[PDB]
Amino acid sequence: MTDIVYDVEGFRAFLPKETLRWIRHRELERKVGVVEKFSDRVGPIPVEIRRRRSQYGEFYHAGKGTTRIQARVSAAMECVERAAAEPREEIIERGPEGDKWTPAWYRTEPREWVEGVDLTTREPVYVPANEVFHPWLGDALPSHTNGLSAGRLREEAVIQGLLEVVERDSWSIVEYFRIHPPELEVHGELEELRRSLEREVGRVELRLLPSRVEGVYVVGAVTEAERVEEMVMGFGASPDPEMAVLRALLEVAQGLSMARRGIESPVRPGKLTPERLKRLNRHWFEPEGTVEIDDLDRVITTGSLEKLTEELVERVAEAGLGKVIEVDLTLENLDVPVVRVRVTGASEYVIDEARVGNMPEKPPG
Ligand SMILES: Nc1ncnc2c1ncn2[C@@H]1O[C@H](COP(=O)(O)OP(=O)(O)CP(=O)(O)O)[C@@H](O)[C@H]1O
Ligand SMILES: [Mg+2]
C-alpha cells in the first residue's frame, strides 16, 4: 500500500525534488545519451528540451511541468523511456510457448515477440515486438510510443501509460467520426493558466472529449494564432478532471516551445493559412455544448498507488476495448521501471489510420 504524495501533473510516490535529486545521483541523462539541454518558458510554463544520441540517431525529447524541477524530471524520464524502448534481443522470443496477441491489421503471422502480462487475468501473453519497441522497422506498420511510460515504481508507469492509451483512444474517436466535443469551462488557477497561455497566441480553448472509460476524463486544448505553426493541440487524461486540464495546457506550452525552435515533432503540402486550418478543423473550433468542470464526478478518489492502478485497469477492462497488457521494459543497468501498456481494442487512429481498433458503427452520443 504505497502513498500518493504528489498528484499535480501525475500520480507519484515521490516529490519531484526527490526524483530530480535521484535522477542526478544515478547520472541517468548521461547514461541514456543526452548531449544537450535547453530551458524555455512559454508564458509561465517551464519547458525543457533534450538532444539525445543513440545507435538509431539523434532525437529531440521534451519535458514540461508547473515547476522547473518537474519540467526537468519530465524531460529526463522521457529520455529514459525512449532508451528503454529501443529493441533488445535479451527479451525477444521467436518460438513462443503460450497465448499470443495478433492485432487486426497483421495479414501475416509475426515472428518476434515479447512476453507481457494480461492485467485482468494475470496470465502471461505475448505481444509483437513492433507493438513493444521503438523504433522497429521489420513489420507491416510503423512503430510508435503510445502506451510507453517510465516511473519510480512500475505502478506509476502503468497508471501514466494506461491514461495515455485512453487519451489517444478518445482523440482517435473524435478524429475518425469528426465529433464536435463540448467546450470545457474552468475556474481559479486553471483558468488563470489558460488565460496566461492565451496571451502567448490568439486563443486557447478547452474541450471535454468523449471518453470510452468510465471514471476517466480526457481534455483537449486547441489554439488559434496568427502564425499557423503555433496552432497546436494538447491533451490530458486522468480520473481527476483538473489534472486532465492541466496536462492539456502543459502540452500546448510544450508544442509552442517546439514550434518556436522549429522542432519537427510526431511527439508535440503547401503552406496553410490560419483561417483555412480552422475550416479544415471545424469540429475543434465549433464545439457542441458546454460543460462545467464542477459538475464532473470524482468517481475514482486517489489514495494509494496500487489501489489506483487496480481501479483504472478494471475500468479499462470493463470498457469493451479488449485486453489490458503490460510489458516490462526496465533496463538491467539503470534500475528505472519502464513499461509499455497495450489496450488491444483501443483506437490509435491519430497515429496510423490502419490502427482503427474496436470501433462502433455510430459514435457514442
Ligand atoms: N515526477 C515524476 N516521476 C517519475 N517519472 C515521471 C515524473 N513526471 C513525469 N515522468 C515520466 O516522464 C515521461 C514524460 O511525462 P509527461 O508528464 O511529460 O507526459 P507525456 O510525455 O507522457 C506526453 P507524450 O507521451 O505525448 O510525450 C513519462 O514517462 C512520465 O511518466
Ligand atoms: Mg508519454
Q: SS3 for 48-84, per residue?
A: EEEEEEECCEEEEEEEECCCHHHHHHHHHHHHHHHHH
155 CB less than 6 Å from ligand 1?
Answer: no
Nearest-CA residue for ligand 1 atom 3 is 151
Residues near 332 by beta carbon (within 8 Å), at least 6 away in sequence: 90
Q: What is the resolution of this structure in A?
A: 2.3
Instruction: Please check if 156 is assigned to a binding site.
Output: yes
Q: How far apart are CA 132 and CA 257, in angstroms?
A: 29
Compute the distance between CA of residue 196 and CA of residue 198 in angstroms, rounded to an integer. Answer: 5
Ligand nearest to the CA of 75: 1
C-alpha of residue 95 to centroid of ligand 1, in Å: 34
Beta bridge partners of residue 45, listed in sequence order: 42
- Structure obtained using: X-ray
Q: What is the DSSP letter of 351?
A: T
Q: Which residue(s) pair with 121 in the sheet?
A: none
**All 3 cell numbers of residue 237?**
487524461
User: Which residues lie across from 6 on neighbouring strands?
Assistant: 12
226 alpha carbon to ligand 1 midpoint, in Å?
30
Q: Is the CB of 110 under 6 A from ligand 1?
A: no
CB distance 61 to ligand 1 below 6 Å: no
For residue 175, which phi and psi values (nearest 5 degrees)?
-70, -50
Give the residue among 149, 144, 145, 167 at the shortest CA–CA distance from 159: 149
- CA-angle at 346, arms to 340 and 349, nearest 5°: 100
- 85: Cβ–Cβ under 8 A, 6 or more apart, which residues? 132, 133, 134, 145, 148, 329, 338, 340
Angle among Cα 37, 256, 23 to the nearest 5 degrees reads 30
Rounded-to-10 torsion of CA 188, 193, 199, 202: -100
